[PDB]
Design a protein around this ligand. Structure first.
Ligand SMILES: O=P(O)(O)OC[C@H]1O[C@](O)(CO)[C@@H](O)[C@@H]1O
Ligand SMILES: O=P(O)(O)OC[C@H]1O[C@](O)(CO)[C@@H](O)[C@@H]1O
Lengths: 322, 322
């Protein structure tokens, strides 16, 4: 294991730079040469592959985004395209590849380990959405959670001034974790998530009852994987007329300096990926499960919602009580 | 279990209000009357005990500090003093007491459960220092971690401009967790913690070697439980002369709006404390252990440092490499 490469694929998340930094610094500590692959899997195809030195990752732990960049590569599904990637790695004597990203990213890394005997691959879970198996939390979730909390805490100021209900759309793709964690954190009176049956009438009834009880406005926090905020607004309006606004938080949730949890998790996972490569392992995604750093085969990963936490959030809502 | 009381004791931490809110809202959800005790155990003695309603905890989840206040009560060590406290609870028909704070707080709650058959007690771990058993993380740690990261990220700007080394003192009482997590997070080149043998000469040697290698300045992050920053500075100066400054971060680390991790953990623990009281349990501190919500007897609590994480942080330091 003398030479490794690292790339970031899929949507960027805060903490991906800390993960790259830990792969780089851990590899160099162990006298392994490290190559950066730029623009994700597109980099493998275009041969945008460059040796990194210790200084290449200075001034990065605190930075959001990915300094390696990410670009989509749907053509990686063709075995002939993959052969070109493999040869661009093998031309340089690369023996291990670390991929930081989501499921897609892991599928490419699974193909590479299957199609090149001489390359081991390891995946590190990077996404704001918390939707990757093999880990309880993904790199970027904590940061995005705190981004949403900050934004909604601001919205709450204006909601309170005007007794204005807000219907706020959070990211998460098909996962409700961001909406659940953030909604509990901001005291959202209603949280709409794809993992729970949607009953707009019920939500309207709760809101109307609140008003009867002198709760004049509320926050509805809506996971995009369920519906759009604008759809929620339209559906509610069938049942009740309240003074409301829609907010779509958008790509702000993807950015920013990573929190401590993300910088530490990213660092732990990046160093462990390098350790796994040295130990001769392949085709595994790393993670933290029950507060332990673990590795899971891509098979088992491919082949989480905390209903108890959702129950709690509802108990804490004054609308559940009214 | 018809009537419960709640108090905050020991140093305040961000998230204590979210914990009080969850105890209040969970109790009222279960048709239990809740009483706030103000100024910690002093409140029990002065009978500063007032019924809370649902609205008493509005506008609190996001707020730092404790709205119940905290005040020291070393006289609680006298059994005659404790009898007055118990009677102020029993006069009102209180059957359960939730204490949010540290070890001290838990010692009082242990005495109360021993000395009053009719009162069950449960402790919730609230401290920035992460130094309470029965939990992997305390309420406030995540917030304080992110406070330190923000402060040191700023210091790093000025350090970089001037090639100035900073020796920064973090809180934590006798626990190095804050310094470790924050130090890894900011790329501190040296972290000084009470759990590891202190070798100032060694640290000086690493710094001097860095300079030889063109690393002109660094950050030393020092847990107060080891030594003061000013002591570290003085001891280093025996061995090397560098252009340096000392920063003591201080009580800023205690304040601020809690992060999502703290608001969610506080909420989970507050609701679980109420559940334990309903279930007939006593003399237990709650926590999260291996990502599961648990309860531990005060005995077992009274009767954690991640050396692997420390090892990683050192591997990531360019000074460890130079
Ligand atoms: O960056 P894009 O292509 O707009 O995709 C948006 C999606 O990406 C994510 O931000 C990250 O996977 C999702 O939360 C969101 O559904
Ligand atoms: O608030 P005080 O009495 O100055 O005590 C400071 C101590 O309290 C804590 O802030 C919280 O326990 C410690 O980190 C610190 O050593």
């Amino acid at each position: 294991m003398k030479k490794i490469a690292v790339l970031t694929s899929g949507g960027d998340s805060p903490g991906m730079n800390a993960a790259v930094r830990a792969v780089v610094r851990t590899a160099i500590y162990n006298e392994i040469e490290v190559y950066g692959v730029y623009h994700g899997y597109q980099g493998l195809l275009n041969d945008d592959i460059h040796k990194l030195e210790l200084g290449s990752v200075g001034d990065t732990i605190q930075r959001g985004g990915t300094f390696l960049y990410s670009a989509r590569c749907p053509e990686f599904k063709e075995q002939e395209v993959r052969k070109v990637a493999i040869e661009n790695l093998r031309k340089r004597g690369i023996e291990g590849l670390v991929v930081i990203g989501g499921d897609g990213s892991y599928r490419g890394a699974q193909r590479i380990s299957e199609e090149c005997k001489e390359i081991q691959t390891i995946g590190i879970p990077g996404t704001i959405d918390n939707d990757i198996n093999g880990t309880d939390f993904t790199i970027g979730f904590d940061t995005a959670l705190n981004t949403i909390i900050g934004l909604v805490d601001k919205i709450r100021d204006t909601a309170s001034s005007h007794a204005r209900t807000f219907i706020i759309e959070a990211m998460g793709r098909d996962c409700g974790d961001l909406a659940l964690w953030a909604g509990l954190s901001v005291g959202a009176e209603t949280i709409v998530v794809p993992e729970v049956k949607t009953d707009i009438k019920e939500i309207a009834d709760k809101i109307e009852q609140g008003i009867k009880r002198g709760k004049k406005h509320s926050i509805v926090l809506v996971a995009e994987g369920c519906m759009t905020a604008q759809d929620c607004q339209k559906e509610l309006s069938q049942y009740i007329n309240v003074d409301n606004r829609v907010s779509v938080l958008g790509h702000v949730q993807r950015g920013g300096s990573p929190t401590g949890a993300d910088r530490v998790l990213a660092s732990r996972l990046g160093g462990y990926a390098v350790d796994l490569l040295m130990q001769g392992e392949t085709a595994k995604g790393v993670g933290i499960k029950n507060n332990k750093i673990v590795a899971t085969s891509f098979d088992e990963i491919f082949d989480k919602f905390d209903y108890s936490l959702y129950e709690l959030a509802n108990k804490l809502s004054i609308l559940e009580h009214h």
